[PDB]
Amino acid sequence: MEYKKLLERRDSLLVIQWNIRAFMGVKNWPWMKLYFKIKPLLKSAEREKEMASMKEEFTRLKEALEKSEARRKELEEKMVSLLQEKNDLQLQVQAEQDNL
């Protein structure tokens, strides 16, 4: 368990190393180095920002909505079972009065 956790964690660390190595690779001078780092580009930076912001809102609500829908189902299932239990209990109070 220790062996596998160490290997997977160090492999992720190797990905993190690829990330920083990639940046030094990117510390070369192309036209894009100027335009990507600072935000002036309309369709790339602005439309991707719309993609990320809209998706961020949708996915957060997606979570909320799915978990909420489940929670509403769970309550329904609780009310259905409680409805059976409340009726059986109403019958049971008459049965108990018969016990008395």
List residues binding a copy of itself (CB under 8 A): 47, 50-51, 54, 57-58, 60-62, 64-65, 67-69, 71-72, 75-80, 82-86, 89-100
Closest CB to a copy of itself among 17 and 84? Answer: 84
Tell me the C-alpha to C-alpha distance, in Å, between residue 42 and each of 23, 31, 34, 56, 74. 24, 16, 15, 20, 46
- From the list a copy of itself, another protein, none, pick the one residue 23 interacts with, judged by a Cβ distance below 5 to 8 Å according to partner type: another protein
Q: Which stretch binds another protein (CB under 8 A): 46-54, 63-71, 92-100?
A: 46-54
The three-class DSSP label of residue 27 is: coil
Q: Which does 21 bind (CB under 5 to 8 A by kind): another protein, a copy of itself, none?
A: another protein
Calpha distance 85→59 (Å, rounded): 38
Contact 74, 82 (CB under 8 A): no
